[model samples]
Target: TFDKHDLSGFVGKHLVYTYDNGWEYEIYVKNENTLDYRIHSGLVGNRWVKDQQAYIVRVGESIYKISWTEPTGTDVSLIVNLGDSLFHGTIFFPRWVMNNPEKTVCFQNDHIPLMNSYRDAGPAYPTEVIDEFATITFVRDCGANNESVIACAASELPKNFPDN
Candidate 1:
């Protein structure tokens, strides 16, 4: 239930949300107190990534999360542990942002070797929101097998998106 006013220091800064599996997004706040936000995701090949929506979230004193709740089954959400860091703009995305640090690559439309795994998973096309966070642990430190990291777990995962 945090409002835009509560997050004044966060405005006009680029905040990176990093995960254990090495996925991340660069977030920018817009219009100040309205809590309106614009998010830029990691890259795939030569192209820059973007989300399905500009997106919005609620933050407390230090934590922000986007939640999808289901009364009957389970609740799914991505929680970001925000720290005291001020992100500035980058002319080019960091190696991790443009390409996965793991280097788990795929060949489609004939792009580079490693690309963003979160993109184009199942029917969620261009992004695998649920499984990405569910499987990949969020942390600033990635692993040693950086060259082996692939996007998406790649399942028989036929799209069964919930409508709640």
Candidate 2:
């Protein structure tokens, strides 16, 4: 629902924003089994990937879209401003995730299949098919892999689920 800039006060701050043409998304950002970093959002079947976004905060005259990418000290927050004060829980955009790496669990188990593979696997494995192995699982991701207790609200189980 936002772009690469701050949303006008009329709009809202949208950091790490995204959309799938679905209903109200009660999403949960997920982490992996290893070092704290890798992260995934939405349902398990639809996990996190690059370019998948959402808003983080609102600056005076604009909405800021936030999301994941190679772990960096400084994230280039998008600065935008919607003409009028838009009121809504979330906003979507017309962008594609550039998940260049597939080693992460989310990309490995889900996204890679949607990409193209190599030519050695034969017709059964067309080069047009994105190899599942092309990417890594969420476990090793720098953003979604870390264990956190903040996003947990539904169950008593560890907010990070697998971790206790």
Candidate 3:
């Protein structure tokens, strides 16, 4: 149901996406297959940064599907409408609820304490469960020249990020 297309337009591009819930992410396309991103959640005063191997496909003119899996087993898939500056997607949490039993919601990998509820739910196993549906708007096109923005964001991220 997906077809690959030219990915040159995304290479060296820097994009900023703001979610409806106020979370923000700055993504820098490093190459055709690699990217680095920093996510900031002002609501929780949390930040995460990671370099991931990305799978990108162009579904139409100026529209692309981008996806990646985090080290913590979080799966993100997004359909970006570059022409409209809009994106909607889902994030699948494999063991999020199990890991953060006390907290009903979690993001990325915030080292929260595990509770007995995790065990009560049953043994831990990977399942395709949609934890969140993200509706985001593309607010800025930093383009290829804004590597400094990526560098600055990366430097500001918490040193223990992805664990924070």
Candidate 4:
């Protein structure tokens, strides 16, 4: 629910932010692991992998950091610290996420074989799918890789979920 800008007002809130290129970050919890609190900077998952999830809670004046585990064998479930702000200038809040539950997790474990293997496979042809507002663009013909490019219609992104 935010972009690659100032998140000073959402110190105690939870939201999701997707990168301008691809990938996404979901701040599910606020704090205390029981949904109480937040964090700053560090490689939570490991030295190179980093934490899978991240949250920020205002502590007096500064914000506290809370790192969560990422999905198993996932490409990029880690959420890196956003400098001193809620997030760095790498991701932007997307309007499509509210209606699309698919963004809640990656394709590998999305429970849908099509979405998981929509990209180039071991013996499959290259693929490219796009619509009027978004594009699920994958990489070259290769193994199941994570270099796919997802371009969303920034101007057309919705501001909220649609009423059903």
Q: Name the TM-score of candidate 1.
A: 0.31
Question: All candidates: CA RMSD in angstroms?
Answer: 15.9, 13.0, 7.5, 16.3
Provide the overall lDDT of each model, using Cα atoms, as 2-decimal numbers: 0.31, 0.27, 0.56, 0.28
Stronger candidate by lDDT (1 vs 3): 3
What does the lDDT read for residue 152 in candidate 1? 27
Instruction: For candidate 3, write residues 1-164 as lDDT tens digits.
Output: 43467876566666656666565566676666666676655322334443568898888777777899755455678777777767676666556444553242333234323323443453346654543334443444445444444543434666764243
Please provide, for model 1 over 74-144, each residue's C-alpha lDDT reduced to its tens digit, 9 standing for 90 to 100. Answer: 22344444553322122222333333422322322233322323333212222223244322122232222
* Backbone clash total, candidate 1: 12
Stretches of candidate 2 exceeding 4 Å from the true structure: 1-20, 23-45, 49-62, 67-146, 149-164
Q: 119 in model 2: Cα distance from truth in Å? A: 15
TM-scores, one per candidate? 0.31, 0.22, 0.61, 0.27
- The alpha-carbon deviation from the true structure for residue 75 of candidate 2, after best TM-score superposition, in angstroms, is 13
Question: Higher lDDT: candidate 3 or 4?
Answer: 3
Model 1, residue 64: what's the lDDT? 50
Candidate 1: global Cα-lDDT?
0.31
